Amino acid sequence: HSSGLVPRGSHMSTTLAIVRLDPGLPLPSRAHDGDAGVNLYSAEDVELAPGRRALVRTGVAVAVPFGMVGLVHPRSGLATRVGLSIVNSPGTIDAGYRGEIKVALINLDPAAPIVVHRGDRIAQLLVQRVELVELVEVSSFDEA
Amino acid sequence: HSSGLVPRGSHMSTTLAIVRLDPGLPLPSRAHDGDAGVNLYSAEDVELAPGRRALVRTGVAVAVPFGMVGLVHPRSGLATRVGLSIVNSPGTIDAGYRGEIKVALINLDPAAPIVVHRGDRIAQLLVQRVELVELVEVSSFDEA
Amino acid sequence: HSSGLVPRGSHMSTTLAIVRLDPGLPLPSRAHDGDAGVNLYSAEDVELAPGRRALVRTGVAVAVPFGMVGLVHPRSGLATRVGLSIVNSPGTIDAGYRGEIKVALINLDPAAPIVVHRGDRIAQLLVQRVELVELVEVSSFDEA
Numbered sequence: 001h002s003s004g005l006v007p008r009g010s011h012m013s014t015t016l017a018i019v020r021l022d023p024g025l026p027l028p029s030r031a032h033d034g035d036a037g038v039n040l041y042s043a044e045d046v047e048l049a050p051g052r053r054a055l056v057r058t059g060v061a062v063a064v065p066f067g068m069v070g071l072v073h074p075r076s077g078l079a080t081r082v083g084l085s086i087v088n089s090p091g092t093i094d095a096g097y098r099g100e101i102k103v104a105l106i107n108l109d110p111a112a113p114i115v116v117h118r119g120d121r122i123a124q125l126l127v128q129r130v131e132l133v134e135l136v137e138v139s140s141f142d143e144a
Numbered sequence: 145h146s147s148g149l150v151p152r153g154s155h156m157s158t159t160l161a162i163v164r165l166d167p168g169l170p171l172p173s174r175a176h177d178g179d180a181g182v183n184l185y186s187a188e189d190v191e192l193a194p195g196r197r198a199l200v201r202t203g204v205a206v207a208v209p210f211g212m213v214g215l216v217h218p219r220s221g222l223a224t225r226v227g228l229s230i231v232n233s234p235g236t237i238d239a240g241y242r243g244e245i246k247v248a249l250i251n252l253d254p255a256a257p258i259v260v261h262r263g264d265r266i267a268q269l270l271v272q273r274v275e276l277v278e279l280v281e282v283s284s285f286d287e288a
Numbered sequence: 289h290s291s292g293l294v295p296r297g298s299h300m301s302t303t304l305a306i307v308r309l310d311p312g313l314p315l316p317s318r319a320h321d322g323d324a325g326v327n328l329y330s331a332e333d334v335e336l337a338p339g340r341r342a343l344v345r346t347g348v349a350v351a352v353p354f355g356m357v358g359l360v361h362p363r364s365g366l367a368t369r370v371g372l373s374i375v376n377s378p379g380t381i382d383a384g385y386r387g388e389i390k391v392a393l394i395n396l397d398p399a400a401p402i403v404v405h406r407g408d409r410i411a412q413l414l415v416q417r418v419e420l421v422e423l424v425e426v427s428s429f430d431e432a
């Protein structure tokens with residue numbers, strides 16, 4: 001069997017429409033089979049002094065399906081090696097959002113600046129279902 | 145059709161009981177259709193110097209259903225604009241928890257204090273299913 | 289009925305194989321019924337000055353099932369009390385990963401060092417399903 005056939009056990013897996021606003025970057029991909037996230041690239045060069053943060057363009061936009069959420073998580077390697085984090089982690093991408101995904105990077109190292117270059121992988125994007133809960137206000141939890 | 149009718153495609157959507165311990169705040173709501181989270185308010189005024197953190201009352205309590213988790217995520221706007229983050233993000237709200245949701249806000253800006261006023265939206269609350277996994281200890285992964 | 293019988297409503301609950309690389313630590317457990325996470329221990333003593341971070345061994349390895357993700361979240365108590373956080377939170381554990389779970393702890397307090405002792409609970413591990421999305425590149429979202 002070739003690629004185009006959806007294997008049985010992946011019949012149900014979901015699709016995510018994506019637009020490369022920056023066509024010069026590779027499409028986000030999973031580094032390994034079963035990996036939770038696809039790796040987002042930086043569209044830009046940016047240098048972050050200790051304690052500084054930046055809102056960095058990834059060059060993509062996505063259409064998260066209704067009933068789901070996209071989540072932007074930090075890469076573990078850079079987090080440890082150089083103290084790179086994401087201010088609003090986990091970044092919450094709503095089903096209705098059709099703008100460019102931007103990553104609020106922050107340098108949590110005390111002394112060493114972090115240089116990010118265009119084309120570097122700077123975060124990962126997961127997609128999960130979410131319960132769009134209906135609030136039921138009660139006067140006490142007994143009542144419910 | 146009017147509001148009270150549960151549309152077909154939302155027959156299965158879950159309910160979340162909530163108690164406004166602070167009845168003076170609006171109920172948390174989704175800013176847009178399909179948004180992953182409902183926006184939590186601060187019950188209080190608080191001022192956070194750079195690097196400082198506070199445990200801020202939201203004026204609500206919830207009953208996350210068994211088999212699910214509530215998750216407190218930072219708002220992207222404040223995160224970028226002013227460096228506001230959440231120390232324990234993502235905040236983990238257990239199914240059994242019936243206390244007030246409190247938000248561990250922290251100012252990650254190097255120089256500018258953040259002022260939060262009562263009634264400001266300071267986080268978002270998502271609800272997701274969680275696998276309540278049964279651990280199976282093995283001596284090596286082959287064995288399993 | 290005794291323990292070994294899987295109750296009806298937990299017929300479907302998933303298993304997580306785990307190896308204690310450090311057999312001297314307790315197995316991670318849920319502190320209460322319905323808790324989202326199991327509590328990870330530190331295998332080691334470590335002292336974190338303000339602003340410093342460390343990659344701390346938990347003494348376990350796990351096999352997250354294909355179609356799921358493990359997620360390492362900070363404990364709320366330590367986060368508030370002493371400013372302890374996790375640089376890459378939420379830590380993303382892929383289905384394929386068979387190495388030791390390590391926690392990138394960071395001291396976000398301005399002045400007081402944090403001492404972690406072997407055997408202390410330093411994070412929690414959740415397991416959730418994840419959508420292993422198939423990207424569909426489009427030239428505009430209309431097109432899709």
Ligand SMILES: O=c1ccn([C@H]2C[C@H](O)[C@@H](COP(=O)(O)NP(=O)(O)OP(=O)(O)O)O2)c(=O)[nH]1
Nearest residue numbers: 075076077078360379380381382385388389390
């Ligand atoms: O908190 C964590 C996160 C990850 N890990 C392990 C499990 C995970 O599958 C593996 C890779 O993690 P990330 O994808 O978060 N980091 P990065 O993208 O830098 O490394 P890789 O190229 O291996 O994916 O590291 C941990 O032990 N603790």
Ligand SMILES: O=c1ccn([C@H]2C[C@H](O)[C@@H](COP(=O)(O)NP(=O)(O)OP(=O)(O)O)O2)c(=O)[nH]1
Nearest residue numbers: 072091092093094097100101102219220221222
């Ligand atoms: O890391 C992120 C997070 C969000 N976003 C986009 C997608 C999301 O749907 C939109 C709104 O995000 P938040 O709800 O996290 N922030 P805030 O509540 O300040 O803005 P809004 O009023 O638009 O919801 O911003 C990103 O590009 N990157």
Ligand SMILES: O=c1ccn([C@H]2C[C@H](O)[C@@H](COP(=O)(O)NP(=O)(O)OP(=O)(O)O)O2)c(=O)[nH]1
Nearest residue numbers: 216235236237238241244245246363364365366
């Ligand atoms: O952001 C949060 C996180 C938790 N909480 C409440 C709900 C949760 O079920 C309870 C315990 O949270 P954690 O497990 O995250 N922290 P810790 O492990 O220190 O406390 P406990 O021993 O109670 O689990 O604290 C909040 O109000 N806000």
Ligand SMILES: [Mg+2]
Nearest residue numbers: 031075076124
């Ligand atoms: Mg990775």
Ligand SMILES: [Mg+2]
Nearest residue numbers: 175219220268
């Ligand atoms: Mg929002």
Ligand SMILES: [Mg+2]
Nearest residue numbers: 319363364412
């Ligand atoms: Mg706990």
